[PDB]
Amino acid sequence: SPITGLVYDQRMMLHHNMWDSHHPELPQRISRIFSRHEELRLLSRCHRIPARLATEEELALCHSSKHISIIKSSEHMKPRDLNRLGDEYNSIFISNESYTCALLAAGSCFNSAQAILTGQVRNAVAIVRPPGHHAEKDTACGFCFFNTAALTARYAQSITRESLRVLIVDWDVHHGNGTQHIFEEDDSVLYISLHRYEDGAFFPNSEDANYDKVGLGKGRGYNVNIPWNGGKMGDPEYMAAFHHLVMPIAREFAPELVLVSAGFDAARGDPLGGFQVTPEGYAHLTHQLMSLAAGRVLIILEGGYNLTSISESMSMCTSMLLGDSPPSLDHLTPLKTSATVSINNVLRAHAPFWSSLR
Numbered sequence: 001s002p003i004t005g006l007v008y009d010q011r012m013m014l015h016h017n018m019w020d021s022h023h024p025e026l027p028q029r030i031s032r033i034f035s036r037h038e039e040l041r042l043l044s045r046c047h048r049i050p051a052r053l054a055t056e057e058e059l060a061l062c063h064s065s066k067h068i069s070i071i072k073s074s075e076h077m078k079p080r081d082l083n084r085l086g087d088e089y090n091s092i093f094i095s096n097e098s099y100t101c102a103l104l105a106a107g108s109c110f111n112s113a114q115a116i117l118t119g120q121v122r123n124a125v126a127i128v129r130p131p132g133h134h135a136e137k138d139t140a141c142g143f144c145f146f147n148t149a150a151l152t153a154r155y156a157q158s159i160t161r162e163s164l165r166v167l168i169v170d171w172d173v174h175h176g177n178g179t180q181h182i183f184e185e186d187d188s189v190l191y192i193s194l195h196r197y198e199d200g201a202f203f204p205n206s207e208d209a210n211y212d213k214v215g216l217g218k219g220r221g222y223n224v225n226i227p228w229n230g231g232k233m234g235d236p237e238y239m240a241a242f243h244h245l246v247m248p249i250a251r252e253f254a255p256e257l258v259l260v261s262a263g264f265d266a267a268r269g270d271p272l273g274g275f276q277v278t279p280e281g282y283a284h285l286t287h288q289l290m291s292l293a294a295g296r297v298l299i300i301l302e303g304g305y306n307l308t309s310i311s312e313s314m315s316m317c318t319s320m321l322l323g324d325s326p327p328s329l330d331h332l333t334p335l336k337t338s339a340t341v342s343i344n345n346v347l348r349a350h351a352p353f354w355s356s357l358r
């Protein structure tokens, strides 16, 4: 009988915005998600995995010493220096606890990946903040200090073998620019992101997120960007992108571990997303991914800012991991026109690299 792991530690709530207590990357994101897991009796069904701090050596798997040093130094900064330092980055706020919280998010994911790979659990869910996928080797960005998901891929390889095949599926509504760049030349880590794009008119505002960035060097083919160019994208479009692109390429890659950069800011009612993926939609995406890697799937919270939407949606993913039957989902609504164009563009760009694409 498969076991699902869950990691959550309330200390990650201590990271906060000292100048706008209502900033959407709120401490209560993770406490609300946790409370919903309790209310729905999902937590009791999971094997509880402890949180830990990542070490500086583990952060060096993906991040420069200079970047680690500056964020580490924030732990001891006065408020005015914390405000100045955060303003040096694109969309970062920093408190004295931010470094420790970012370490806890990553270490929680390391312990979860270790639990999966050593067979203590089949799959796992990590209710963590601050998020990770915008963080670059050398810089913080977009509410993210260290790239939790990228680090976890490298940590996984470190405790198994260097060539362990890791799939990172990033379904946060924004492009994980950091994850793409860290693995852009790497054919051991397949990065697939779906994201609102709008010709660069959506954070992180760069053409790096377009469908024609397919990877570099021996990494060519191992970066798959599925960019959306409309709005009100929802279950039909995400289901179709998984059917035509994500699952065929993932099967051809044959990952041994699946990490999900699981932002829930493509969910209904999110001012930072504008999309309408339903909890049932997220369930179906999770369940499709469980078909890979002998079920070795780790779900990692990234963004997502409507407290009710992220709590319902992430709980539905945990329900899928636990083996519950996927809910009824509509399969008949026609796609938005732009979404057919996006999927077609990615298929044409990735035809050279993935023989099973049609």
Ligand SMILES: CCCCC(=O)N(CCCC)Cc1ccc(C(=O)NO)cc1
Binding pocket: 024, 091, 131, 134, 142, 143, 172, 173, 174, 203, 263, 265, 272, 302, 303, 304
């Ligand atoms: C101000 C420009 C319009 C909004 C914007 O671009 N912002 C918001 C700044 C504060 C809300 C930066 C941002 C947005 C989303 C994420 C995220 O959710 N990533 O996964 C990260 C960073």
Ligand SMILES: [K+]
Binding pocket: 170, 171, 172, 173, 174, 175, 176, 193, 194, 195
């Ligand atoms: K994404």
Ligand SMILES: [K+]
Binding pocket: 183, 184, 185, 186, 187, 189, 190, 191, 215, 219, 222, 223
């Ligand atoms: K890659």
Ligand SMILES: [Zn+2]
Binding pocket: 172, 173, 174, 263, 265, 302, 303, 304
């Ligand atoms: Zn996001």
